[PDB]
């Protein structure tokens, strides 16, 4: 027939890695460091580098078992290899931060089970296998819980107690993938935050990179340069926070995401001219792109301030998440966020007042604090906006009644 | 091959509209009013009518931008048009209920982004775009939050703070659609009630109409005349509440749903002979169909009363929803519902008692109030049903212990 | 084309039944009893047997209506038949445990609606029909709630107030099924525990058996012998608890699951040589297989004890479920479970201490009770593990601070 064709399911990958066929490739490049693998026919070597030299010294390994998957954190180095006709699939951990004399452990998966993806969390490690199993391990080598995956894994990321799994929930058509996300919190009270929700992607695009921001919010990038971030303040939906194609000059130009930071806001990525991944040598330079939510009429003052407001809102939801889970957060960052947002609301209200849009001013005042609304009432008494001042006063009464 | 064939995904639509190819078509017909579009080669006009003349005067617009999507509420008129080679896709709002002198605003979507569906809520508006984005706007023109859709939108509806999105979650086979529902509450505490649950449909049917009842419960109709309603009292499942094919006399006869009302119960729709949608002229007459849940042996007294009981139960769940969300509800309606249900239970218990089904009587008494159970005990002492009276007494003891 | 092919959706089935084409087949074989159907051209008979003769006497029925689906519980016998050109699809219940003189009821489904699956709960019965409807009935014959199914049903099971539905959520490819699970609790507070989550299956396998353990935990088996159980302590994920292929000697050997028991742990199944289901005559013998979670390096002492620990953890989650839902549970079973787990942790800590893996000892002590940690501190003071004793002491301080 001549209709929709099933899209081939994309293969699993480690975020921040370059393809396996390269002689000198990146196994992982994140906010902790870089892991490179030089593999020809004579020898196979793995080199580990840390951005902060104080964390650990440079580590060089002789890749005898031919490790093809790697992840790096401030605690350990995680390595994995598939099975051969003689050896089993192995998970290798270099626990360099351990305070004891045993800084290494390795485990063999059962017969005919191959590791397809790994990720490192805070004090734990996870491995998705060809048996549609997810195996949890402590950073010291204890086997934790095991559960089955609803489909073949695509990529896996970890941060703190959070586990971020993207897998094939179905079969897409006409170039589209059919991906689902399983988001778990592996603390003392186990929670499945997302029960295989559909992962939004740009049409005819595939998954290019997943992970967490340094502050601990799940994020991912598709092959069309669209960067999306979990919106905890919007029912755990996914909000686009950047479009790396706006910084590209041609079709063959791409950006290779390395890390995401919310405070200060910066998207650390490698500019790539001619391909989607940078060559290992010479050392590529990390670029810093700004985040921009895809808002309408962003060239106008209204659209510009509206984008700045909602970007400030979503990039400070992590403070509430750190508070709800007992983590440590700076109360000063929370206060600066509110002041930054109340200033943008106040400037947007003054703009709507100049445009004689007084109903819009009351809508903006609904997002304001009680102090900001009281200030907007006196600004409305000024400039002879008498009815607007009355509507704002009635809004201030309603806000005080909500307490 | 000769097997299952992929079903073509149905295109987005506005509920209560007639096809675009008509010279004189309905853009939207709901419980607020009617919006018609007359478009030939000479001129293009849009006419707005309100069922209640006291709400607003009849509005006539010169459709210069060729708006093809429309929605209507007691607050504003929402219009949208796709992009051309010279103009961008635009969202136009006629805020006629505004108390200020600015009763109009329009916004341009970014390049190559087209509006595919719109809907109006209480004080807000939403637009699903070709970029798989959902854009939220206040009724006054402020851009609110934005998040990505898991698939191409099919239809969109709003009521109060609730957002009702139906989209393609996959690809169906053999005439079946693969639809998912995302139900959000956009109040001060954002909630995603349904994380893309599968939307039940009749086999080989497509989505024909979605929306909310006047009381605020999500409902939808498929192409086979099956009307389904969210069952908040049954874990947010979907319960069939009507079958418009029972009122049709032939295959070519159809009913075109306009609105759904829970108190009093009535399904307002347009009878259509020969097609699925009514012609614009002459003005079609609104028919009132009754709701009937698809219960077994409904011709018998037992099945008839069982259908009346569960229809009364599901059509009063909205009272609990209005109470939990601080909305205003009549306590008298809640009391009349319970009295209506306790009377049906009492008549079903008397029927089971006549049939010497005393175990069934105790099952019916489990659904009764403590006062109704005490009354059933004295009715069981009467007519010499001594063991039944003892079982009902032990049930009354258990009910008092649950407090 | 030459690519992925759509997998034909498997047909609905009753767990514990043998195919319909057999002259003498099992309609259901569970922990309550056996129901056999002998059907040739001369006569059609249904025989009911109870494992405990004290429950009820053996029942013999003349299958005049040609019932093809059956389920059995300690309360009633449930039978169902499809519709013919003269008769409707019927649901028949033999309420043998009733304390009244009416121990039978039957109901007719509407025109062109056929029963596809049934299941028995505590005091209720459910039937999934060809109209994508789920109909609830009390054990005495009262019609309860009705809601629509997101797809064609595959199998259905019930236990207490829990309803376990597996259905087709999509179309799989290359031999894979696309199954979803809807898990409901039908008590006085209706809850949808699983909103159509994807059902994990072994690749290229179909669903072979579903049901609940005697303690009330959902479980299911695929065609590759993998037995999975709901992990309530792991965010309602699914954990493999057995692999019946490890007990098979050849490809043609299979195990036919009958029941699952958590305390004592035993998987009751019928060994089958040459086919997937046992012949009705002679009476097959019920085998008892042990549960084994698929852990790595299970031949080693570490892997063996780690498997025993997590098997003990998951097979005692039902005690917490019985407690949260007011059910009756033995506090002695909960105490024996903790003692069994603290002993395994203590032996694993002593093993890690012998291997000079002191960081791993602290990880194991995190899973210990406060008394077990205090004991591990004195064991660490012994054998001159001074730093380990300090780390365990700081862990004991942190545990006391969590109260």
Tokens of A26: 């990146």
* Chain A residue at shortest CA distance from B142: A360
Q: For strand A191-198 and strand A207-212, is the pairing parallel, antiparallel, or unpaired? A: unpaired
DSSP B240-300: EEEEGGGG-SSTTEEEEEEEEEETTEEEEEEEEESSSS--SSSPPPPEEEPP----TTTTS
B249 with B274: CB under 8 angstroms?
A: no
Q: Could B200 and C148 be called an inter-chain contact, meaning their C-beta atoms sit closer than 8 Å? A: yes
| Chain A nearest CA to C310, separation (Å) | 7
Q: Could A100 and C172 be called an inter-chain contact, meaning their C-beta atoms sit closer than 8 Å? A: no
Length of chain B measured in residues: 403
Q: Could B147 and A237 be called an inter-chain contact, meaning their C-beta atoms sit closer than 8 Å? A: yes
Q: How far apart are CA B4 and CA A290, in angstroms?
A: 47
Angle made by CA atoms A20, A23, A24, in degrees to the nearest 5: 90
| Chain A nearest CA to B19, separation (Å) | 25
Q: Which of A92, A105, A145 to mutate to test the interface with C (most CBs of C within 10 A)?
A: A145
Write down the experimental method used for this entry: cryo-EM
| Chain C nearest CA to B342, separation (Å) | 15
Q: For strand B226-231 and strand B237-243, is the pairing parallel, antiparallel, or unpaired? A: antiparallel
In sequence order, the 6+-apart residues with CB closer than 8 A to the CB of C10 are: C154, C177, C206, C207
Based on the number of CB atoms within 10 Å of its own CB, is B285 exposed (0-12), middle (13-18) or buried (19 or more)? Answer: exposed
Q: Which of A296, A351, A399 to mutate to test the interface with B (most CBs of B within 10 A)?
A: A296
- Greatest C-alpha distance within chain C: 86
* Chain C residue at shortest CA distance from A185: C235
Question: Measured in whole angstroms, how far is the alpha carbon of residue A205 from the centre of its chain?
Answer: 18
Other chains touching C, judged by 3 or more CB pairs under 8 Å: A, B
Selecting from B98, B147, B195 the residue whose C-beta is nearest the C-beta of A234 gives B147
In sequence order, the 6+-apart residues with CB closer than 8 A to the CB of A81 are: A65, A66, A67, A68, A69, A89, A90, A92, A115
Q: Could A194 and B190 be called an inter-chain contact, meaning their C-beta atoms sit closer than 8 Å? A: no
Q: Which residues of A touch C238 (CB under 8 A)?
A: 147-148
Interface of B with A (CB under 8 A): 5-6, 8, 95, 98-102, 105, 107-110, 123, 131-133, 135, 138-151, 169-171, 180, 184-185, 190-192, 195-196
Q: Could A233 and B184 be called an inter-chain contact, meaning their C-beta atoms sit closer than 8 Å? A: no
Strand order in the sheet with C287-289: C253-262, C265-273, C287-289
Q: Which residues of C touch B231 (CB under 8 A)?
A: 145, 147
B207 with B179: CB under 8 angstroms?
A: yes
Q: How far apart are CA C380 and CA C358, in angstroms?
A: 10
* Chain C residue at shortest CA distance from A187: C234
Rg (CA), chain B: 25
Q: Which residues of A touch B148 (CB under 8 A)?
A: 200, 228, 237-240
Based on the number of CB atoms within 10 Å of its own CB, is A311 exposed (0-12), middle (13-18) or buried (19 or more)? Answer: buried
Selecting from A170, A197, A201 the residue whose C-beta is nearest the C-beta of B170 gives A170
Peptide bond into A81 cis (omega under 30): no
Q: How far apart are CA B266 and CA B122, in angstroms?
A: 23
Q: Could B145 and A348 be called an inter-chain contact, meaning their C-beta atoms sit closer than 8 Å? A: no
Q: Could A150 and C294 be called an inter-chain contact, meaning their C-beta atoms sit closer than 8 Å? A: no
* Chain A residue at shortest CA distance from B9: A4
Q: How far apart are CA A156 and CA A153, in angstroms?
A: 8
* Chain B residue at shortest CA distance from C130: B203
Q: Could C239 and A138 be called an inter-chain contact, meaning their C-beta atoms sit closer than 8 Å? A: no
Rg (CA), chain A: 25
Other chains touching B, judged by 3 or more CB pairs under 8 Å: A, C
In the block, residue with structure tokens 């106040």 = A346
Listed resolution, Å: 6.8
DSSP C252-266: TEEEEEEEEEETTEE
Size of interface B-C (CB pairs under 8 A): 116
Q: Could B306 and C98 be called an inter-chain contact, meaning their C-beta atoms sit closer than 8 Å? A: no
Backbone angles phi, psi at B191, to 5 degrees: -135, 135
Q: Could B295 and C143 be called an inter-chain contact, meaning their C-beta atoms sit closer than 8 Å? A: yes
In sequence order, the 6+-apart residues with CB closer than 8 A to the CB of A175 are: A7, A203, A204, A205
Strand order in the sheet with A226-231: A207-212, A218-222, A226-231, A237-243
Q: Which residues of C touch B228 (CB under 8 A)?
A: 148
A308 with A290: CB under 8 angstroms?
A: no
Selecting from A101, A133, A138 the residue whose C-beta is nearest the C-beta of C294 gives A133
| Chain C nearest CA to A238, separation (Å) | 20
Q: How far apart are CA A268 and CA C228, in angstroms?
A: 42
Other chains touching A, judged by 3 or more CB pairs under 8 Å: B, C
* End-to-end Cα separation, chain A, in angstroms: 64
Q: Which residues of A touch B107 (CB under 8 A)?
A: 296-297
Selecting from B100, B108, B180 the residue whose C-beta is nearest the C-beta of A357 gives B100
Length of chain C measured in residues: 403
Closest to C137 measured CA to CA, from C119, C125, C123, C149: C125
Closest to C278 measured CA to CA, from C37, C10, C12, C29: C29
Angle made by CA atoms C281, C285, C287, in degrees to the nearest 5: 145
Q: How far is CA A15 from CA A155, A263, A275, B265, C292, in A?
A: 7, 22, 16, 55, 34
Closest to C220 measured CA to CA, from C193, C240, C192: C240
* Chain B residue at shortest CA distance from C193: B235
In sequence order, the 6+-apart residues with CB closer than 8 A to the CB of B61 are: B45, B46, B47, B48, B79, B94
Q: How far apart are CA A254 and CA A249, in angstroms?
A: 9
Q: How far apart are CA B93 and CA A357, in angstroms?
A: 14
Q: Which residues of A touch C240 (CB under 8 A)?
A: 133, 146, 148
Strand order in the sheet with B287-289: B253-262, B265-273, B287-289
Q: Could A169 and C200 be called an inter-chain contact, meaning their C-beta atoms sit closer than 8 Å? A: no
Q: Which residues of C touch B178 (CB under 8 A)?
A: 170
Q: How far apart are CA B6 and CA B173, in angstroms?
A: 5
* Helices of type H across A267-385: 301-314, 317-324, 331-354, 358-366, 370-381
Q: Could B310 and C98 be called an inter-chain contact, meaning their C-beta atoms sit closer than 8 Å? A: no
Q: Could B297 and C151 be called an inter-chain contact, meaning their C-beta atoms sit closer than 8 Å? A: no
C25 with C45: CB under 8 angstroms?
A: no
In sequence order, the 6+-apart residues with CB closer than 8 A to the CB of C191 are: B235, C184, C185
Q: How far apart are CA C192 and CA C145, in angstroms?
A: 14
B287 with B255: CB under 8 angstroms?
A: yes
Q: Which of A195, A325, A326 to mutate to test the interface with C (most CBs of C within 10 A)?
A: A195
C69 with C89: CB under 8 angstroms?
A: no
Q: How far is CA A226 from CA A158, A203, A314, B260, in A?
A: 21, 11, 16, 40
- Report DSSP state, residue A382: G
In the block, residue with structure tokens 């592996």 = A186
C147 with B234: CB under 8 angstroms?
A: yes
A367 with A375: CB under 8 angstroms?
A: no
B167 with B154: CB under 8 angstroms?
A: yes
Q: Which residues of A touch C358 (CB under 8 A)?
A: 99-100, 102
Q: How far apart are CA B118 and CA B126, in angstroms?
A: 6
A226 with A202: CB under 8 angstroms?
A: yes
* Chain A residue at shortest CA distance from B105: A357
In the block, residue with structure tokens 């686009």 = A240
Q: For strand B124-129 and strand B115-120, is the pairing parallel, antiparallel, or unpaired? A: antiparallel
């Amino acid at each position: 027939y001549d209709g929709p064709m099933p899209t081939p399911r994309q293969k699993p990958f480690q975020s921040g890695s370059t393809p396996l066929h390269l002689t000198h490739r990146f196994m992982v490049w994140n906010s902790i460091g870089i892991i490179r693998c030089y593999n020809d026919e004579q020898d196979n070597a793995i080199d580990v580098e840390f951005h902060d030299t104080s964390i650990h010294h440079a580590t060089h390994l002789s890749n005898t078992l031919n490790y093809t998957i790697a992840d790096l954190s401030h605690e350990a180095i995680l390595l994995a290899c598939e099975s051969t006709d003689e050896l089993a699939s192995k998970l290798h951990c270099l626990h360099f931060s351990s305070w004891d004399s045993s800084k290494e452990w390795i485990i063999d998966l059962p017969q005919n089970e191959d590791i397809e993806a790994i990720c490192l969390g805070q004090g734990w490690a996870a491995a998705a296998t060809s048996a549609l199993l997810l195996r949890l391990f402590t950073i010291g080598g204890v086997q934790k819980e095991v559960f089955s995956l609803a489909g073949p894994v695509v990529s896996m990321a970890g941060h703190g107690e959070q586990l971020f799994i993207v897998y094939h929930r179905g079969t897409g058509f006409d170039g589209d993938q059919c991906l689902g996300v399983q988001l778990l919190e592996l603390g003392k009270k186990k929670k499945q935050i997302l029960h295989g929700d559909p992962l939004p992607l740009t049409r005819k695009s595939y998954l290019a990179w997943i992970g967490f921001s340094a502050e601990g919010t799940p994020c991912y990038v598709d092959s069309e340069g669209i960067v999306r971030m979990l919106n905890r303040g919007l029912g755990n939906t996914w909000t686009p926070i950047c479009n790396t194609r706006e910084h590209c000059k041609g079709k063959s130009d791409h950006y290779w995401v390395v890390g995401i930071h919310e405070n200060p806001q910066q998207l650390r990525c490698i500019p790539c001219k001619g391909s989607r991944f940078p060559p290992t040598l010479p050392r590529p330079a990390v670029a810093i792109l700004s985040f921009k939510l895809p808002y309408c009429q962003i060239a106008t003052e209204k659209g510009q301030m509206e984008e700045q407001f909602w970007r400030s809102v979503i990039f400070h939801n992590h403070l509430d998440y750190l508070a709800k889970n007992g983590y440590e957060y700076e109360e000063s960052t929370k206060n600066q966020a509110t002041k930054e947002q109340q200033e943008l609301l106040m400037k947007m209200l003054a703009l709507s007042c100049k445009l004689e849009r007084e109903f819009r001013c009351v809508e903006l005042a609904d997002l304001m604090t009680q102090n900001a609304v009281n200030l907007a009432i006196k600004y409305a008494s000024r400039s002879r906006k008498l009815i607007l001042a009355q509507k704002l006063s009635e809004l201030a009464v309603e806000k005080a009644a909500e307490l």
